[PDB]
């Protein structure tokens, strides 16, 4: 395991050093998106929650293709405003339900340390 706690204040600095391999060691789901919502990284833990195969979703658009249930003001709406503002740090509960058993999760979205990338972190509640 990589020891990092969900919701940690300095999480973006810690994750900056991790490769896809290390990301797979986290205790929670982690997705990295570009400013358009394309998936740059997707870890094993997120795959465990959602059923998606991590290698098969990289390169696809999270909001349009992979996770249309997040296409709403409550999720996508918050992401887009964060991208526009260049600042994002929000935590909320949500239910993932597209092609899967409805699963309640806690979501934390945060701007990454690099210019135009964004993290989505996910854990069961
Ligand atoms: C709602 O959340 C719908 C789908 C979904 C699929 C994959 C991932 O990672 C999150 C959400």
Swiss-Prot record:
GO terms for molecular function: identical protein binding; photoreceptor activity. The 4-hydroxycinnamic acid (p-coumaric acid) chromophore is covalently bound via a thioester linkage. The keyword Lyase does not apply. The modification S-(4-hydroxycinnamyl)cysteine is found at residue 69. Keywords: Chromophore, Photoreceptor protein, Receptor, Sensory transduction. Residues 23-86 form the PAS domain. One of its GO terms (biological process) is regulation of DNA-templated transcription. It holds the Pfam family PAS. Disulfide bonds: none annotated. InterPro entries: PAS, PAS-like_dom_sf, PAS_fold, PYP. Transmembrane segments: none annotated. Monomer. Photoactive blue light protein. Probably functions as a photoreceptor for a negative phototaxis response. Belongs to the photoactive yellow protein family. This is Photoactive yellow protein.
